[PDB]
Amino acid sequence: LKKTTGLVGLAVCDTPHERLTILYTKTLDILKHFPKHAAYRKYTEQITNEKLDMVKAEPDVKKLEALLQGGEVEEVILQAEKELSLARKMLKWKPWEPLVEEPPANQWKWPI
Amino acid sequence: NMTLNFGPQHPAAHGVLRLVLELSGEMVRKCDPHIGLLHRGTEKLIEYKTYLQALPYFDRLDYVSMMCNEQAYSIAVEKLLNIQPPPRAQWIRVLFGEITRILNHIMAVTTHALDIGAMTPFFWMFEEREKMFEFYERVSGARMHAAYIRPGGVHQDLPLGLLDDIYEFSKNFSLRIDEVEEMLTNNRIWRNRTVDIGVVTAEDALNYGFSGVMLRGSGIQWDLRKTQPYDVYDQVEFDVPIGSRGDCYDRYLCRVEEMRQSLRIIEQCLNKMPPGEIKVDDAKVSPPKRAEMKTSMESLIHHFKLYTEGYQVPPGATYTAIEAPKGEFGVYLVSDGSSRPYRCKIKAPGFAHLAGLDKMSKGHMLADVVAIIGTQDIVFGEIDR
Amino acid sequence: VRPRSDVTHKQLSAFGEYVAEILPKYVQQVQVSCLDELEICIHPDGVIPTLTFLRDHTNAQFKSLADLTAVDVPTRQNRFEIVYNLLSLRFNSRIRVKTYADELTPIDSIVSVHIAANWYEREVWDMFGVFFFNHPDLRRILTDYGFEGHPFRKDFPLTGYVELRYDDEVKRVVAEPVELAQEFRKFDLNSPWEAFPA
Amino acid sequence: ITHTGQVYDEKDYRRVRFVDRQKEVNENFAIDLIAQQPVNEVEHRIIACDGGGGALGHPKVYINLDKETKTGTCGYCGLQFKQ
Amino acid sequence: TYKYVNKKEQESEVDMKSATDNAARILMWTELIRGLGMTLSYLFREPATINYPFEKGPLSPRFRGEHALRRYPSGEERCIACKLCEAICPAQAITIEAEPRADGSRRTTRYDIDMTKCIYCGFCQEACPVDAIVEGPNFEFSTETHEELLYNKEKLLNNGDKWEAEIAANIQADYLYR
Amino acid sequence: TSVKPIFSRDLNEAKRRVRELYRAWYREVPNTVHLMQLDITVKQGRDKVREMFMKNAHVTDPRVVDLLVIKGKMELQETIKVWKQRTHVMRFFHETETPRPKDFLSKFYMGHDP
Amino acid sequence: VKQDMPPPGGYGPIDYKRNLPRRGLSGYSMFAVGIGALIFGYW
Amino acid sequence: QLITVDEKLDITTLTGVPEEHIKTRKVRIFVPARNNMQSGVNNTKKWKMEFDTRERWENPLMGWASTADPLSNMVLTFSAKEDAIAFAEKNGWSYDVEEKKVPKPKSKSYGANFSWNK
Amino acid sequence: AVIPHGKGGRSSVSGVVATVFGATGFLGRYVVNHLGRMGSQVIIPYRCDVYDIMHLRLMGDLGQLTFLEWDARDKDSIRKAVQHSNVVINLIGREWETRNFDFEDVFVNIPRAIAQASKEAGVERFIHVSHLNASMKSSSKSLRSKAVGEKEVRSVFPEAIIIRPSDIFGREDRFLNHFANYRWFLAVPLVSLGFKTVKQPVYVADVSKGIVNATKDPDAVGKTFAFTGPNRYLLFHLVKYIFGMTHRTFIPYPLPLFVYSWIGKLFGLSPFEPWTTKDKVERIHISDVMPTDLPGLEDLGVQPTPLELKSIEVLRRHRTYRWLSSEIEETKPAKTVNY
Amino acid sequence: ASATRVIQKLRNWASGQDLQAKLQLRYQEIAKRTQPPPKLPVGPSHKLSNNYYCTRDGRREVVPPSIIMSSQEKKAVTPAPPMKRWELSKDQPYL
Ligand SMILES: NC(=O)C1=CN([C@@H]2O[C@H](COP(=O)(O)OP(=O)(O)OC[C@H]3O[C@@H](n4cnc5c(N)ncnc54)[C@H](OP(=O)(O)O)[C@@H]3O)[C@@H](O)[C@H]2O)C=CC1
Ligand code: SF4
Ligand SMILES: [Zn+2]
């Protein structure tokens, strides 16, 4: 429909709503393994669910671009799978855990 | 891929760049730029100097954009002190901030052509440059390396008459840009050597931290001057020249377009510069006027302490970035309560751009490498610092 | 007196909490300066994880690395304070993530997270001596090819220990221990009187 | 020779520097040039020497010409004034 | 506000007339001829160069140029060795040591500006309370030997005496501004 | 105590790496003396390598050793991938500088502060 | 009082946009010239 | 897993200092006193360690002071005595710490000056 | 005097103010190098235009090297040069008797006037340099004339050190380059086929360091040191060795000297610096004298440096691209002759 | 300037522009030197009253950074409001 996105490298993705719905539903799935009260799971699930809901609700891509911001729809696709990649990465990282180690004392005292 | 060690051959210059390269005949397989041929210690030297005596270092960091760099340190030192410059000084800094952008673009576009082989554009626009320098001199005293924009505003009000001349020039400069155009924008040959050379994707440009025309040329819309306004660049109205099909030719067109847009910003500044003072009234930060220091005791004490010891900035750290002509110029200035800084990493739009030379010039000929160093406006002072 | 909007000191503050919550395993302190700048502080092990979350999170996209630097507080056990300043072109905000590294306790490299860091990390090794694991090609960038010592360390003499001159006898440039003809006059500038409670 | 009696000894070798060259010195010496200017006979106990030219001169200072014996001398110009 | 440079708004479908116009552009190098016209045009413009020795590029009063030490009209050198010109010099160029002169006045026994060290910032011009050290107009002081560039009090005082008339005029023009 | 290992878990494993670097330099000395047309003897140079590798013989800590070879490897790279020209290499030999005596009487006769 | 300021009423307007003039002979007409030279030249 | 080392962090081998200036340089850790000229005490707060002073011969051509010692102008500032001692040990410089000496409390009261018999 | 302060390198002071009249020379260049390195005050009297002495400027530090215009025939020029020097070193010498200067002048006449003035001045010590094996009866006018000088100057300046170097080995020297340059000549004549003229070269630096050490040592007064070398050589190996490093064919063909003195006469006629000299020829085949004398090197503090060690640097320019990378190890050494 | 009309006409044509109207060389249009003396304005803080510095010294009224999350339902929050799309220019959208 559009001829091309402003960003040089990005290429127009036809069926953008379908591509987003695929990525958004996947992320939601991966997040399902995160610990229940894990902060990343609750926060990202909230963001992704709102994004899908809007993608499901809006059948016009131009208004879809306005509703979840994202500039061009193609970028939103890149951001979603980038997040999908990190969600997979953090499950391995287990950052929801407590602080690895307290800072050596006086480590953060700037006046010095 | 016989290493040629090209660049100590003064072939693209912009400073002294040993671009060790491996070339299968006339094709470049890998470019490993070497840097530090101009490292001079600017970051360590500053730790041993007071805030006002480190201002002259910033002009030398990237001296084709002499002042715009000074504004970045100014802003940074003003933030740490939570002081702001007076209204007239702000407009001045935007006036000379833009004049400086033109000066940089005339350098970048014309020096680009000299390496390409077009030599007449350089002489055409260096005469215009010359005329601009004279503004610097009649405002600061130095043709370049002024030291005019200080941490609390400008040093001295504009001479009585400069604005009028920064008009006559501006009123005409356009035609000069127009001429260059009739020689290069559509040359049947400029396009070839520039078009589709060093294309950088949008995602890759953000990833390698390009942050400049280089991003804007790829179509990413980011001008720190519109996104995060500094000084009174908010009160003016200009159009960022975004580009598509980012390549050497497109970005060029962008640099010619900001030369055009800066004339739009300069016009306004001349039309709307306010009556007022050009330096903060806090003798604490700005040095007292010489009539005052020669008649009032509190002013001498403030003059003596300011020049001998210093501002005494409150302890803290800040990263302030402006839109220097090359790209995002930022100073991370950590500061103890002392009058002399503790650290001052200068982010140079250029350390990031050079790094990209490798990911831009791939499967390219020796001549292509020369074109790409030009499209990054590399001034080795900022990269080497 | 500069104009300050508390809208930002509130927005940024909240984000700080958001990051902290999402990455509690590494975030030690998260502060907003009086200058409206956030500065999450992370354990050195959280270099990879905290950056990646910021580069690839819908509610916090921090795509470009503005700078990687290392202040050196000699007093601090962990001498260096690697500081990474990032920008989010999507949310028009910058954040700084700063970690601590001692001389012989290397930090991970983020060239993976941002390739901008390929050069700055080499710059930090050359000047301060911090080492970055998994770096593609770590090697001196700014200093001379044979330079010995890391220059921006606070314990390195400004003038340095070696200077170069051309010697006819050997017809080649030759280092010699530095001999300066007017030593750097070290003006003492600190005043014996404080300014405010701070 | 110079303002401060800087005269390389007959045996010093920096005199080689002056060999085949002029040792730069100024005939006009201040210690003497100020003397020529006469004492200003002001009629007020305390007078001020702005330095001549106001802003184009030296920091303003007030001199007490009360001592009848001596004359006040501006720490800046060296100009002397007597009551 | 943004602006697309090099973005083709639409796909103009080739029309013979259009094609010919284009083909002619490639075949008969029409745009190349356009570029030649521009340079021929200037060939006819008056050249902007100046006879350097005979004519000089204009420098206004604030030009920093070469250091000089001024003297009071009476003949007493202005410097009173407060030594903050040394304090604020960014390059460590000025070296000053002083002692009370026989008159009892304060004066500098040695004032040495190392011009090779100096980066001509003009802060010394700024800092001096008596304004004894000034940035003199002369920029032509190129020297055969490095030692000549190092300047002691006698060279600067002599430089001051030679250029005092113009220095006074220059300071006269710019002091209201400062 | 309680330190984290940089690359070598113990002086033993670390020493392995030093051996490798020595070999590297040993095999390289000859090439440099030829590709840089240096006026030195391969044997002479190879002794220099030994000198340096032992100047730091005292280090007992594994972490310090590991960095030392990282740095050492970097130097080799600058000399085999030649980015370091003769001036740089010969500096190792301290050819121009006048050697200073370490005898007390010698120093007394020459310098205020020994 | 007297400081360097924009003249009353503001300065005049300055042009910044490209003023490159699309001046040339139309392509068909152009071809004819060269073709005519050849056509005549051959005769 | 972490490894154990009882070796005092000495990193003299990595710092990159010429041998002469690591074995012949004595640094003193001291809290700066107050020039009696001023009564402010903000410069007597942080500990500083300063390297031993060395030759300052006059220069023949201009009479400027000339120094051959690189570590002369370097004075590092450390917040606490323990941290400064650590810097000397790992860098291998010899140290001789001087205990801080703070003014002892002094009892003052304006009434005394008007004492019947002082 | 000047108390010696500093660490020992440039920008330091050693307290030796020294006129050095023939500094522009091959030996000279080296003498100024060490004197400048040490931090000594060096006055360089020069006659050639400034362009040619630029090579001496970077040596020494600012205000440490002073250049004075001087003419040998004009006594006044020598007078002012030594006015403020306390050490005078004389390296005045040439191989080709020039139109306006005879071997006497360059060796005996001039070097006398110089030391003569130096005394009038009150210079603490004068070092006079004369060629090795210099009999007042030696065949080469040069050597004999030089001998004549070392005597005279002793009467103008008593207790004046007289170092007497052998032909010198160094880059830019003749001894080594001359032979190597015989390449242009297809055949390389060698009197007695390069035999019975054993020669002991000495590295230039060794000579220089030695000379400098003299200036700063009380042990040398009236001493006639002889810097010689670390190994002697029959001219045959030397010639071939040279050609060896130069990697150019060696074709030793004997040439009767009586005829060869004539060849020297030929080039000698050359207006522009004759390449060979009748007086040279003799000198070249003049056998090196034995080493029984006030020792020079080592005695004055520098251990001689073998020829083979640095030969590679002196003879490299004469090789061809093909052999440029070749190194000393690849090549063979020459053989000494304790004879 | 000072060009015979014909040269000017050739100039204007070959260039395609009225270069005469905007000559690069400057002639009697540049600000004359010795412009009149300047009496510059004194800014605020020069009042002789109600000018207490304590009420005008932002330098050190600044305080140590505010600290959150020190080591010693809830909605998602962004670094800041998502950025607003820039709008195409209206004087010259393209070119
Ligand atoms: N192989 C050797 O070099 C040996 C040398 N010596 C002795 O050592 C001394 C230095 O030798 P070397 O450096 O090779 O000699 P050079 O041929 O290099 O000349 C030495 C210097 O003498 C100066 N000089 C020569 N003639 C005159 C003159 N008529 N008037 C003024 N100055 C003059 C030259 O100055 P300019 O060029 O400006 O005229 C030159 O700088 C010689 O005197 C020689 O007798 C002894 C044994 C071996
Ligand atoms: S400031 Fe002016 S007066 Fe004070 S010393 Fe420097 S020069 Fe002499
Ligand atoms: Zn006075």
mmCIF file of all heavy atoms in Angstrom, chain F residues 1-3 5 9 58 60-64 68 71 113, chain H residues 1-7 9-10 13-14 20 53-55:
data_model
loop_
_atom_site.group_PDB
_atom_site.id
_atom_site.type_symbol
_atom_site.label_atom_id
_atom_site.label_comp_id
_atom_site.label_asym_id
_atom_site.label_seq_id
_atom_site.Cartn_x
_atom_site.Cartn_y
_atom_site.Cartn_z
ATOM 1 N N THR F 1 41.812 -11.542 49.708
ATOM 2 C CA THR F 1 41.695 -12.835 48.987
ATOM 3 C C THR F 1 40.344 -12.889 48.274
ATOM 4 O O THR F 1 39.766 -11.808 48.053
ATOM 5 C CB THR F 1 41.853 -14.011 49.963
ATOM 6 O OG1 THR F 1 40.599 -14.233 50.607
ATOM 7 C CG2 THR F 1 42.918 -13.766 51.006
ATOM 8 N N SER F 2 39.872 -14.089 47.923
ATOM 9 C CA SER F 2 38.514 -14.237 47.335
ATOM 10 C C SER F 2 38.413 -13.452 46.020
ATOM 11 O O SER F 2 37.423 -12.713 45.866
ATOM 12 C CB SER F 2 37.472 -13.922 48.378
ATOM 13 O OG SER F 2 37.731 -14.627 49.581
ATOM 14 N N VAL F 3 39.355 -13.620 45.103
ATOM 15 C CA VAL F 3 39.343 -12.865 43.860
ATOM 16 C C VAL F 3 38.703 -13.646 42.729
ATOM 17 O O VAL F 3 38.691 -14.869 42.752
ATOM 18 C CB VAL F 3 40.772 -12.481 43.454
ATOM 19 C CG1 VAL F 3 41.474 -11.793 44.611
ATOM 20 C CG2 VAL F 3 41.552 -13.707 43.017
ATOM 21 N N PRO F 5 38.590 -14.963 38.862
ATOM 22 C CA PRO F 5 39.637 -15.257 37.882
ATOM 23 C C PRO F 5 39.418 -14.559 36.540
ATOM 24 O O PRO F 5 38.322 -14.627 35.990
ATOM 25 C CB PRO F 5 39.523 -16.767 37.719
ATOM 26 C CG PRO F 5 38.091 -17.067 37.992
ATOM 27 C CD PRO F 5 37.623 -16.062 39.003
ATOM 28 N N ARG F 9 42.684 -19.822 35.949
ATOM 29 C CA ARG F 9 42.261 -20.187 37.293
ATOM 30 C C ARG F 9 43.397 -20.238 38.304
ATOM 31 O O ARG F 9 43.163 -20.092 39.497
ATOM 32 C CB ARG F 9 41.559 -21.540 37.254
ATOM 33 C CG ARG F 9 40.342 -21.584 36.347
ATOM 34 C CD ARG F 9 39.166 -20.853 36.966
ATOM 35 N NE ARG F 9 38.882 -21.333 38.315
ATOM 36 C CZ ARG F 9 37.794 -21.015 39.006
ATOM 37 N NH1 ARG F 9 36.873 -20.229 38.468
ATOM 38 N NH2 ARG F 9 37.620 -21.495 40.230
ATOM 39 N N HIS F 58 58.775 -12.168 38.781
ATOM 40 C CA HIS F 58 58.351 -12.200 40.208
ATOM 41 C C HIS F 58 56.835 -12.332 40.410
ATOM 42 O O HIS F 58 56.440 -12.838 41.475
ATOM 43 C CB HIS F 58 58.864 -10.952 40.937
ATOM 44 C CG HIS F 58 58.377 -9.665 40.366
ATOM 45 N ND1 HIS F 58 58.876 -9.148 39.187
ATOM 46 C CD2 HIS F 58 57.460 -8.778 40.809
ATOM 47 C CE1 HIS F 58 58.282 -8.003 38.928
ATOM 48 N NE2 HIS F 58 57.405 -7.755 39.903
ATOM 49 N N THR F 60 53.391 -13.344 41.267
ATOM 50 C CA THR F 60 52.869 -14.627 41.796
ATOM 51 C C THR F 60 51.354 -14.789 41.555
ATOM 52 O O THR F 60 50.865 -15.921 41.420
ATOM 53 C CB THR F 60 53.228 -14.706 43.284
ATOM 54 O OG1 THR F 60 52.589 -13.610 43.943
ATOM 55 C CG2 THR F 60 54.719 -14.656 43.534
ATOM 56 N N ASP F 61 50.651 -13.654 41.492
ATOM 57 C CA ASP F 61 49.174 -13.678 41.312
ATOM 58 C C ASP F 61 48.698 -14.077 39.916
ATOM 59 O O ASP F 61 49.188 -13.487 38.936
ATOM 60 C CB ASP F 61 48.637 -12.306 41.724
ATOM 61 C CG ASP F 61 47.121 -12.251 41.770
ATOM 62 O OD1 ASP F 61 46.553 -12.726 42.768
ATOM 63 O OD2 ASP F 61 46.523 -11.736 40.807
ATOM 64 N N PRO F 62 47.741 -15.015 39.781
ATOM 65 C CA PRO F 62 47.317 -15.482 38.464
ATOM 66 C C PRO F 62 46.701 -14.359 37.630
ATOM 67 O O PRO F 62 47.004 -14.274 36.457
ATOM 68 C CB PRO F 62 46.196 -16.473 38.800
ATOM 69 C CG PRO F 62 46.498 -16.928 40.207
ATOM 70 C CD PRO F 62 47.056 -15.694 40.876
ATOM 71 N N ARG F 63 45.880 -13.519 38.254
ATOM 72 C CA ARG F 63 45.158 -12.476 37.478
ATOM 73 C C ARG F 63 46.175 -11.541 36.829
ATOM 74 O O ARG F 63 46.009 -11.220 35.641
ATOM 75 C CB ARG F 63 44.210 -11.710 38.400
ATOM 76 C CG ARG F 63 42.926 -12.456 38.724
ATOM 77 C CD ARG F 63 42.343 -12.014 40.049
ATOM 78 N NE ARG F 63 43.362 -11.862 41.076
ATOM 79 C CZ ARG F 63 43.441 -10.824 41.900
ATOM 80 N NH1 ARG F 63 42.560 -9.845 41.804
ATOM 81 N NH2 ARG F 63 44.396 -10.763 42.808
ATOM 82 N N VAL F 64 47.203 -11.147 37.580
ATOM 83 C CA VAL F 64 48.179 -10.165 37.031
ATOM 84 C C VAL F 64 48.865 -10.805 35.823
ATOM 85 O O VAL F 64 49.029 -10.110 34.804
ATOM 86 C CB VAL F 64 49.186 -9.705 38.099
ATOM 87 C CG1 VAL F 64 50.038 -8.547 37.608
ATOM 88 C CG2 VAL F 64 48.494 -9.335 39.401
ATOM 89 N N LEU F 68 49.068 -9.657 31.813
ATOM 90 C CA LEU F 68 50.372 -9.383 31.259
ATOM 91 C C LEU F 68 50.565 -9.976 29.881
ATOM 92 O O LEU F 68 51.160 -9.351 29.019
ATOM 93 C CB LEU F 68 51.475 -9.830 32.208
ATOM 94 C CG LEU F 68 51.765 -8.876 33.359
ATOM 95 C CD1 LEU F 68 52.765 -9.489 34.321
ATOM 96 C CD2 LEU F 68 52.290 -7.566 32.801
ATOM 97 N N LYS F 71 48.388 -8.158 27.320
ATOM 98 C CA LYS F 71 49.113 -6.998 26.864
ATOM 99 C C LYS F 71 50.260 -7.430 25.989
ATOM 100 O O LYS F 71 50.546 -6.802 24.981
ATOM 101 C CB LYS F 71 49.655 -6.198 28.029
ATOM 102 C CG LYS F 71 48.609 -5.516 28.888
ATOM 103 C CD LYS F 71 49.284 -4.658 29.943
ATOM 104 C CE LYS F 71 48.275 -3.869 30.753
ATOM 105 N NZ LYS F 71 48.947 -2.950 31.711
ATOM 106 N N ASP F 113 69.687 13.968 43.971
ATOM 107 C CA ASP F 113 68.756 13.000 44.521
ATOM 108 C C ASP F 113 68.892 11.661 43.820
ATOM 109 O O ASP F 113 68.539 11.524 42.652
ATOM 110 C CB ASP F 113 67.325 13.516 44.408
ATOM 111 C CG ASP F 113 67.141 14.879 45.044
ATOM 112 O OD1 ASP F 113 68.067 15.349 45.736
ATOM 113 O OD2 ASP F 113 66.065 15.478 44.857
ATOM 114 N N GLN H 1 33.688 -19.539 39.575
ATOM 115 C CA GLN H 1 34.114 -19.646 40.955
ATOM 116 C C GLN H 1 35.325 -18.768 41.173
ATOM 117 O O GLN H 1 36.124 -18.566 40.264
ATOM 118 C CB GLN H 1 34.444 -21.095 41.293
ATOM 119 C CG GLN H 1 35.006 -21.296 42.688
ATOM 120 C CD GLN H 1 35.375 -22.738 42.967
ATOM 121 O OE1 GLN H 1 35.909 -23.062 44.027
ATOM 122 N NE2 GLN H 1 35.091 -23.616 42.011
ATOM 123 N N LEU H 2 35.458 -18.230 42.375
ATOM 124 C CA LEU H 2 36.576 -17.350 42.663
ATOM 125 C C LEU H 2 37.821 -18.118 43.045
ATOM 126 O O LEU H 2 37.737 -19.212 43.596
ATOM 127 C CB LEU H 2 36.208 -16.379 43.787
ATOM 128 C CG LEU H 2 35.217 -15.254 43.480
ATOM 129 C CD1 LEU H 2 33.876 -15.789 43.009
ATOM 130 C CD2 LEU H 2 35.038 -14.371 44.704
ATOM 131 N N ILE H 3 38.979 -17.553 42.748
ATOM 132 C CA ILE H 3 40.220 -18.171 43.132
ATOM 133 C C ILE H 3 40.911 -17.400 44.319
ATOM 134 O O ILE H 3 40.789 -16.096 44.554
ATOM 135 C CB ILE H 3 41.188 -18.254 41.962
ATOM 136 C CG1 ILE H 3 41.647 -16.856 41.552
ATOM 137 C CG2 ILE H 3 40.525 -18.955 40.786
ATOM 138 C CD1 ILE H 3 42.612 -16.849 40.390
ATOM 139 N N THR H 4 41.655 -18.161 45.107
ATOM 140 C CA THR H 4 42.375 -17.503 46.207
ATOM 141 C C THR H 4 43.798 -17.026 46.096
ATOM 142 O O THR H 4 44.654 -17.774 45.623
ATOM 143 C CB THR H 4 42.433 -18.516 47.355
ATOM 144 O OG1 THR H 4 41.105 -18.920 47.699
ATOM 145 C CG2 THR H 4 43.099 -17.891 48.570
ATOM 146 N N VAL H 5 44.060 -15.775 46.455
ATOM 147 C CA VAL H 5 45.405 -15.223 46.352
ATOM 148 C C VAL H 5 45.687 -14.427 47.606
ATOM 149 O O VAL H 5 44.898 -13.566 48.000
ATOM 150 C CB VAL H 5 45.673 -14.397 45.104
ATOM 151 C CG1 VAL H 5 45.299 -15.197 43.865
ATOM 152 C CG2 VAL H 5 44.881 -13.103 45.153
ATOM 153 N N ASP H 6 46.793 -14.727 48.269
ATOM 154 C CA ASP H 6 47.137 -14.016 49.486
ATOM 155 C C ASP H 6 48.139 -12.937 49.122
ATOM 156 O O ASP H 6 48.543 -12.141 49.967
ATOM 157 C CB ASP H 6 47.661 -14.988 50.539
ATOM 158 C CG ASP H 6 46.618 -16.007 50.951
ATOM 159 O OD1 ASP H 6 45.521 -16.009 50.353
ATOM 160 O OD2 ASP H 6 46.894 -16.803 51.873
ATOM 161 N N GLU H 7 48.530 -12.903 47.855
ATOM 162 C CA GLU H 7 49.470 -11.893 47.413
ATOM 163 C C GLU H 7 48.949 -10.475 47.412
ATOM 164 O O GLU H 7 47.993 -10.162 46.707
ATOM 165 C CB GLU H 7 49.946 -12.213 46.001
ATOM 166 C CG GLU H 7 51.002 -11.261 45.477
ATOM 167 C CD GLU H 7 52.290 -11.353 46.265
ATOM 168 O OE1 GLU H 7 52.431 -12.315 47.045
ATOM 169 O OE2 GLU H 7 53.155 -10.466 46.108
ATOM 170 N N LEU H 9 47.863 -7.203 46.441
ATOM 171 C CA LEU H 9 47.678 -6.781 45.071
ATOM 172 C C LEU H 9 48.883 -5.927 44.876
ATOM 173 O O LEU H 9 49.142 -5.037 45.675
ATOM 174 C CB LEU H 9 46.428 -5.967 44.777
ATOM 175 C CG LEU H 9 45.145 -6.775 44.596
ATOM 176 C CD1 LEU H 9 44.005 -5.867 44.156
ATOM 177 C CD2 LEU H 9 45.377 -7.868 43.566
ATOM 178 N N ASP H 10 49.703 -6.286 43.921
ATOM 179 C CA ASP H 10 50.812 -5.454 43.588
ATOM 180 C C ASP H 10 50.446 -5.516 42.168
ATOM 181 O O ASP H 10 50.018 -6.575 41.743
ATOM 182 C CB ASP H 10 52.132 -6.152 43.781
ATOM 183 C CG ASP H 10 53.292 -5.188 43.844
ATOM 184 O OD1 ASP H 10 53.083 -4.044 44.291
ATOM 185 O OD2 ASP H 10 54.413 -5.577 43.458
ATOM 186 N N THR H 13 53.516 -4.211 37.951
ATOM 187 C CA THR H 13 53.920 -4.704 36.648
ATOM 188 C C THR H 13 52.995 -4.250 35.536
ATOM 189 O O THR H 13 53.339 -4.365 34.365
ATOM 190 C CB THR H 13 53.991 -6.234 36.662
ATOM 191 O OG1 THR H 13 52.786 -6.760 37.226
ATOM 192 C CG2 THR H 13 55.161 -6.697 37.503
ATOM 193 N N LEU H 14 51.829 -3.732 35.886
ATOM 194 C CA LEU H 14 50.862 -3.338 34.871
ATOM 195 C C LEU H 14 50.751 -1.831 34.747
ATOM 196 O O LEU H 14 50.416 -1.316 33.687
ATOM 197 C CB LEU H 14 49.496 -3.920 35.212
ATOM 198 C CG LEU H 14 49.188 -5.390 34.950
ATOM 199 C CD1 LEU H 14 50.358 -6.264 35.339
ATOM 200 C CD2 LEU H 14 47.934 -5.802 35.704
ATOM 201 N N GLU H 20 63.032 3.028 37.694
ATOM 202 C CA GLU H 20 63.666 3.974 38.645
ATOM 203 C C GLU H 20 62.651 4.677 39.548
ATOM 204 O O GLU H 20 62.909 4.745 40.759
ATOM 205 C CB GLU H 20 64.435 5.010 37.827
ATOM 206 C CG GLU H 20 65.471 5.768 38.637
ATOM 207 C CD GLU H 20 65.113 7.215 38.936
ATOM 208 O OE1 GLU H 20 64.253 7.768 38.224
ATOM 209 O OE2 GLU H 20 65.695 7.785 39.880
ATOM 210 N N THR H 53 60.025 15.205 46.752
ATOM 211 C CA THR H 53 60.473 16.299 45.852
ATOM 212 C C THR H 53 61.831 15.970 45.220
ATOM 213 O O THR H 53 62.632 15.299 45.892
ATOM 214 C CB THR H 53 60.443 17.641 46.588
ATOM 215 O OG1 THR H 53 61.667 17.757 47.311
ATOM 216 C CG2 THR H 53 59.268 17.760 47.533
ATOM 217 N N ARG H 54 62.090 16.446 43.995
ATOM 218 C CA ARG H 54 63.337 16.092 43.262
ATOM 219 C C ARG H 54 63.990 17.337 42.648
ATOM 220 O O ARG H 54 63.508 18.444 42.950
ATOM 221 C CB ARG H 54 63.060 15.023 42.206
ATOM 222 C CG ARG H 54 62.922 13.618 42.773
ATOM 223 C CD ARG H 54 64.174 13.192 43.510
ATOM 224 N NE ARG H 54 63.981 11.995 44.314
ATOM 225 C CZ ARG H 54 64.283 10.768 43.910
ATOM 226 N NH1 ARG H 54 64.790 10.572 42.706
ATOM 227 N NH2 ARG H 54 64.074 9.741 44.711
ATOM 228 N N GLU H 55 65.006 17.170 41.788
ATOM 229 C CA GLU H 55 65.808 18.316 41.264
ATOM 230 C C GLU H 55 64.993 19.387 40.548
ATOM 231 O O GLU H 55 64.112 19.030 39.752
ATOM 232 C CB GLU H 55 66.872 17.814 40.284
ATOM 233 C CG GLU H 55 68.124 18.675 40.262
ATOM 234 C CD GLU H 55 69.211 18.213 39.307
ATOM 235 O OE1 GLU H 55 69.010 17.188 38.630
ATOM 236 O OE2 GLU H 55 70.261 18.886 39.241
#
